[PDB]
């Protein structure tokens, strides 16, 4: 029941995806720009990744 990945902030997108899929194999990953407003629907298998201009995780990835 791992729903957040604090350890991944600063990691590259590609790196992040591997850890997540390892922890939550059914995860549906989506990459979005950091500092954005997003939709408030809750999807149990989704993992939004917010990245900086460098493609590094900028916020703690969590399920929803």
């Amino acid at each position: 029941l791992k729903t957040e990945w604090p350890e991944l902030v600063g990691k590259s997108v590609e790196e992040a995806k591997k850890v997540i899929l390892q922890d939550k194999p059914e995860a549906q990953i989506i990459v979005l720009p950091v500092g954005t407003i997003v939709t408030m629907e809750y999807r149990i298998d989704r993992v939004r990744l917010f990245v900086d201009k460098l493609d590094n995780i900028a916020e703690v990835p969590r399920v929803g």
Partner: protein, 275 residues
């Protein structure tokens, strides 16, 4: 045939429809990912797009916006569903791209449009974890101008002693809406805090989806439009009430569900509120 989603009857909208109040001539702006205006169960009054690369607001490449719109005002006919305020004037204000995200400025821009174009009600089924002086200013401005602003409280669940309400839900000028299920229990994902105002059905919400479909979604996103819709119904009955009067009626006539930290004032009751 037509189906009435449970959320719609849970807040008592039908009692109002039967008296002849269906939100006629109330202008509601759905600030979202656009609305599929081609949906047989929707009637879009107009709109504007704030997304630079996506100029047609009547093209919902995400689906979120269409779903939310359906809760507000799916048409009263013999097909699909029924919105809380089926006679409402629906405006599609697209501030989110296909990926369900938008720059803070796009959102602000939409609010600005909303105000300038005399929307009565604004629905914001969106949020961010941080505020902005500019964001605060836009919502405050909307309310100072007489608009009813409702937003999703957020889907962050509980976090110890801390409030998990997002932006713009967090701002006092905004009605921040939580999610309950058909049994009036708070959904586990529903953000909590002193800033949570009211609850509305947000679990297993059947609504409109792009390309003539229907489907159920979960989220505070789904709860929000119920309240937006309710405000429209109240204004259809009391066209002379101020935003302040609308908000008050909604907050003072709820069904108490439990601790306000988790439930705000409780579940809205449009029938009671419209009194």
């Amino acid at each position: 045939a037509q189906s009435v989603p449970y959320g719609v009857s849970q807040i008592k909208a039908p009692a109002l429809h039967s008296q002849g109040y269906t939100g006629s001539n109330v202008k509601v702006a759905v600030i979202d990912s656009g609305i599929d205006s081609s949906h047989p169960d929707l009637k879009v009054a107009g709109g504007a797009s704030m997304v630079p690369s996506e100029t047609n607001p009547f093209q919902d490449n995400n689906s979120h916006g269409t779903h939310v719109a359906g809760t507000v005002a799916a048409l009263n006919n013999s097909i699909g569903v029924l919105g809380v305020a089926p006679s409402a004037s629906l405006y599609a204000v697209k501030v989110l791209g296909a990926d369900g995200s938008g720059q803070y400025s796009w959102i602000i821009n939409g609010i600005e449009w909303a105000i300038a174009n005399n929307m009565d009600v604004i629905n914001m089924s969106l949020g961010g974890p941080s505020g902005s002086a500019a964001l605060k200013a836009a919502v405050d401005k909307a309310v100072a101008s007489g608009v009813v602003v409702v937003a999703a409280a957020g889907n962050e669940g509980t976090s110890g002693s801390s409030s998990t309400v997002g932006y713009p839900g967090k701002y006092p000028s905004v009605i921040a809406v939580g999610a309950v299920d058909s049994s009036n229990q708070r959904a586990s994902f529903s953000s909590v805090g002193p800033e949570l105002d009211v609850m509305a059905p947000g679990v297993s919400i059947q609504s409109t989806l792009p390309g003539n479909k229907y489907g159920a979604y979960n989220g505070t996103s789904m709860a929000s439009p119920h309240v937006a819709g309710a405000a429209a119904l109240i204004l259809s009955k009391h066209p002379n009430w101020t935003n302040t009067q609308v908000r008050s009626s909604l907050q003072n006539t709820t069904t108490k569900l439990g601790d306000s930290f988790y439930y705000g004032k409780g579940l809205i009751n449009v029938q009671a509120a419209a009194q």
